[PDB]
Amino acid sequence: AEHVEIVEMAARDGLQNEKRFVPTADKIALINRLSDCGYARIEATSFVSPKWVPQLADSREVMAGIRRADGVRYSVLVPNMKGYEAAAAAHADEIAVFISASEGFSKANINCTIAESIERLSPVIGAAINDGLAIRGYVSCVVECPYDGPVTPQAVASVTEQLFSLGCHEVSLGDTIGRGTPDTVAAMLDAVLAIAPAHSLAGHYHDTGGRALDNIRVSLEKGLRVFDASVGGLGGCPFAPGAKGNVDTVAVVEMLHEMGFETGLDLDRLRSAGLFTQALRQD
Ligand SMILES: [Ca+2]
């Protein structure tokens, strides 16, 4: 059977998109359960300014309290060189950088232009490659931006091509506001597939509009075999409060299996993990 991998987002992307601070011990307990689910990669935390995202200010303690299943790679998001150092100190297995395909979102989230965010990221990616660490890149607003509206496939393919050229081994195309449909997503992938193999692409679709599972099917048909999701849908959407955020990891694997795809994940463990996160999602 054909294999499909999922990178868990609950620990970083999920908790980041929650209007509350989860106790460090709870974050650690949450990551330890995920580690027994069968994931190959888990994004444990982020070393980004505690003032811009206090939810993960305990990124250092987390990496230290977590247990290393040794067969699992624990990655962390890195905003700059200062972050890379902390990630290297925290013994991160892999690194992850982020940029936006939308100019308006970039100078509103990273506070700089797309081209400038790429330049500054040039050295951090270089430092990582030097230390033998794997680096994945995130691209936001691959379909639509809450600021500039629709984003052309070409814009997404441009920044995606520059991330790989810098060194990234994989790029996650994220539908930031979950406004993507099978059509827009398909037109985006086509552009990206023209300058990069499906093998190095990961799909990151929010279910905010209830189309995440549909956008994933299209990606599968296009060749993508990696997708990002949150075990219990952790991390909503700021532009759509209360609304569904990340695609639920459970929903994705249950569909994938029905399609004959093997994920290598334990559904039971996964459901149990989701229930856990829900104990912090609602309150
Ligand atoms: Ca997300």
UniProtKB/TrEMBL annotation:
One of its GO terms (biological process) is ketone body biosynthetic process. Keywords: Calcium, Lyase, Metal-binding. InterPro entries: Aldolase_TIM, HMGL, PYR_CT. Ca(2+) binds at residues 13, 204, 206, 246. The keyword Metal-binding applies. It is an enzyme of class 4 (lyase). The keyword Lyase applies. Its EC number is 4.1.3.4. One of its GO terms (molecular function) is hydroxymethylglutaryl-CoA lyase activity. Gene3D superfamilies: Aldolase class I. Belongs to the HMG-CoA lyase family. This is Hydroxymethylglutaryl-CoA lyase.
